[PDB]
Short mmCIF file of C-alpha atoms (C1' of nucleotides) in Angstrom, two decimals:
data_model
loop_
_atom_site.label_atom_id
_atom_site.label_comp_id
_atom_site.label_asym_id
_atom_site.label_seq_id
_atom_site.Cartn_x
_atom_site.Cartn_y
_atom_site.Cartn_z
CA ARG B 1 0.00 0.00 0.00
CA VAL B 2 2.96 2.29 -0.74
CA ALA B 3 2.38 3.70 -4.23
CA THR B 4 4.26 6.49 -6.00
CA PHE B 5 3.51 7.91 -9.45
CA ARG B 6 6.77 8.68 -11.27
CA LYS B 7 6.77 9.99 -14.85
CA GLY B 8 9.55 12.28 -16.04
CA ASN B 9 9.81 14.94 -13.33
CA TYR B 10 6.33 14.48 -11.84
CA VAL B 11 6.29 12.76 -8.44
CA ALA B 12 3.03 11.97 -6.66
CA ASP B 13 2.18 9.44 -3.95
CA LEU B 14 -1.11 7.56 -4.36
CA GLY B 15 -1.07 6.04 -0.88
CA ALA B 16 1.72 7.00 1.52
CA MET B 17 4.00 10.02 1.78
CA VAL B 18 3.20 12.11 4.87
CA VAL B 19 4.16 11.08 8.40
CA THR B 20 3.03 12.45 11.79
CA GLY B 21 6.31 13.70 13.28
CA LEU B 22 9.83 12.57 14.15
CA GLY B 23 9.66 12.60 17.96
CA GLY B 24 9.98 8.95 18.94
CA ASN B 25 9.14 7.79 15.42
CA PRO B 26 11.47 5.10 14.02
CA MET B 27 10.88 6.84 10.67
CA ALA B 28 13.44 9.46 11.75
CA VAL B 29 16.13 6.77 11.75
CA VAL B 30 14.78 5.41 8.45
CA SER B 31 15.21 8.91 7.04
CA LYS B 32 18.76 8.94 8.41
CA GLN B 33 19.32 5.54 6.74
CA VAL B 34 17.47 5.83 3.41
CA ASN B 35 17.88 8.99 1.33
CA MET B 36 14.65 10.78 2.30
CA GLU B 37 14.20 14.50 1.66
CA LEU B 38 11.74 15.61 4.35
CA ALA B 39 9.76 18.84 3.93
CA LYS B 40 7.64 20.41 6.66
CA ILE B 41 3.90 20.99 6.18
CA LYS B 42 2.58 24.53 6.55
CA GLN B 43 -0.68 24.14 8.49
CA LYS B 44 -2.15 27.28 6.89
CA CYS B 45 -5.17 25.94 4.99
CA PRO B 46 -7.53 28.60 3.61
CA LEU B 47 -11.14 27.65 2.90
CA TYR B 48 -13.22 28.73 -0.09
CA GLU B 49 -16.93 27.99 -0.47
"C1'" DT R 1 -6.20 56.12 63.48
"C1'" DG R 2 -10.03 58.14 61.22
"C1'" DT R 3 -14.83 59.83 60.59
"C1'" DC R 4 -19.27 61.51 61.76
"C1'" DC R 5 -22.32 63.38 65.15
"C1'" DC R 6 -23.60 64.41 69.61
"C1'" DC R 7 -23.40 67.41 73.08
"C1'" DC R 8 -21.40 72.10 75.02
"C1'" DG R 9 -21.48 76.71 75.12
"C1'" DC R 10 -24.05 81.08 74.30
"C1'" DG R 11 -27.55 84.61 72.83
"C1'" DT R 12 -32.47 85.32 72.60
"C1'" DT R 13 -37.28 83.89 73.58
"C1'" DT R 14 -40.86 81.70 76.67
"C1'" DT R 15 -42.73 79.97 81.03
"C1'" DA R 16 -43.89 79.32 85.69
"C1'" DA R 17 -41.47 79.02 89.99
"C1'" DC R 18 -41.45 81.68 94.02
"C1'" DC R 19 -43.04 85.01 97.46
"C1'" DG R 20 -46.34 87.59 99.93
"C1'" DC R 21 -50.91 87.61 102.03
"C1'" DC R 22 -55.57 86.22 103.11
"C1'" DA R 23 -59.49 82.91 103.70
"C1'" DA R 24 -61.37 78.26 105.44
"C1'" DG R 25 -62.38 73.83 107.06
"C1'" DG R 26 -60.34 69.01 107.36
"C1'" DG R 27 -58.53 66.30 110.39
"C1'" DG R 28 -55.33 65.28 113.97
"C1'" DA R 29 -54.57 65.88 118.93
"C1'" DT R 30 -56.44 65.64 123.44
"C1'" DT R 31 -59.75 63.98 127.27
"C1'" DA R 32 -63.08 61.50 129.57
"C1'" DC R 33 -65.46 56.90 130.12
"C1'" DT R 34 -66.47 51.86 129.77
"C1'" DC R 35 -65.67 47.20 128.85
"C1'" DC R 36 -63.66 43.73 126.23
"C1'" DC R 37 -59.42 41.41 126.01
"C1'" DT R 38 -55.27 39.69 127.56
"C1'" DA R 39 -51.65 38.60 131.48
"C1'" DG R 40 -51.47 35.82 135.23
"C1'" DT R 41 -52.61 31.52 137.81
"C1'" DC R 42 -53.78 26.76 138.41
"C1'" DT R 43 -54.76 21.72 136.84
"C1'" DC R 44 -55.02 18.50 133.11
"C1'" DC R 45 -52.92 15.63 129.16
"C1'" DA R 46 -51.85 14.73 124.44
"C1'" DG R 47 -49.15 16.73 120.89
"C1'" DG R 48 -44.40 16.75 119.97
"C1'" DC R 49 -39.74 15.03 120.47
"C1'" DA R 50 -35.95 11.37 121.43
"C1'" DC R 51 -34.82 6.88 120.43
"C1'" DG R 52 -34.67 2.76 117.92
"C1'" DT R 53 -35.13 0.36 113.49
"C1'" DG R 54 -35.92 -1.26 108.92
"C1'" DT R 55 -35.17 -0.42 103.67
"C1'" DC R 56 -35.25 1.58 99.34
"C1'" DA R 57 -33.90 6.18 96.95
"C1'" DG R 58 -29.74 7.45 95.65
"C1'" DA R 59 -24.59 7.62 95.35
"C1'" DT R 60 -20.62 4.80 93.02
"C1'" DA R 61 -18.23 1.97 89.61
"C1'" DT R 62 -17.99 0.42 85.16
"C1'" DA R 63 -19.32 -0.26 80.28
"C1'" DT R 64 -21.38 1.87 75.86
"C1'" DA R 65 -23.53 4.91 72.77
"C1'" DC R 66 -24.03 10.06 71.31
"C1'" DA R 67 -22.16 14.79 70.29
"C1'" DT R 68 -18.96 17.84 68.71
"C1'" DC R 69 -14.92 19.99 67.97
"C1'" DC R 70 -11.18 20.77 65.07
"C1'" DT R 71 -7.71 19.63 61.59
"C1'" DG R 72 -6.77 17.51 57.38
"C1'" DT R 73 -7.79 15.63 53.05
"C1'" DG R 74 -10.49 16.42 48.85
"C1'" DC R 75 -12.30 19.91 45.27
"C1'" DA R 76 -12.40 24.08 42.00
"C1'" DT R 77 -10.60 28.11 39.83
"C1'" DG R 78 -7.45 31.56 38.54
"C1'" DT R 79 -2.96 32.56 37.22
"C1'" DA R 80 1.72 32.04 35.80
"C1'" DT R 81 5.03 29.60 33.06
"C1'" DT R 82 6.69 27.18 29.17
"C1'" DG R 83 6.69 24.75 24.78
"C1'" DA R 84 5.32 24.81 20.19
"C1'" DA R 85 3.72 26.50 16.05
"C1'" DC R 86 2.51 30.26 13.33
"C1'" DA R 87 4.75 34.25 11.46
"C1'" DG R 88 10.99 37.02 9.11
"C1'" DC R 89 15.65 37.90 6.18
"C1'" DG R 90 19.22 36.52 3.58
"C1'" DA R 91 22.58 33.42 1.08
"C1'" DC R 92 22.84 29.70 -1.84
"C1'" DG R 93 22.23 26.58 -5.96
"C1'" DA R 94 19.22 24.91 -9.66
"C1'" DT R 95 16.60 26.10 -13.56
#
DNA sequence: TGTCCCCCGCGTTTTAACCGCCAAGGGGATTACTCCCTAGTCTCCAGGCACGTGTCAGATATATACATCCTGTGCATGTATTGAACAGCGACGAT
C-alpha cells in the first residue's frame, strides 16, 4: 500500500507520503538511513466555499 | 487612626417658679369613760420530740452509645510559566 507515481519529473504518492512527526518515530532513523528529503507541512489551509 | 455626630457653650425667647398675704375647714390631737381582752394563775394531758429500726432512693463503679470539635484531606478556579507552532531575512544553488 505504498504507491508512487513517477513519470519524467512528476512525483506523486497515491497512498503513503506524509508522516506524523519525528519525535519517537522510528521513521526518523529510516530517514537517516534511506535517502529521504523531508519537507515540513505549513498548516495554513484557507477555505473557499 | 479616622470619621461623623452628639453634646457644650451662648444669645435670645418663653414659662412658671417663688413670694407675699388672706381665707377656710379638714382632720389630727387631746380627754373623759367603759368594757372587752389579755396577762397571770392553776390543773389537766396529748401533741411533739428522742430513740430505735428497717429499707429503698440514691450515690458509686464500670461499660457503651451520642455529640462535637477541630484539623486535614479532597475539590475548584485563577494565574503564571513554558513549549510549540505560526509568522521574518538573507545566502545559496538549480533552472
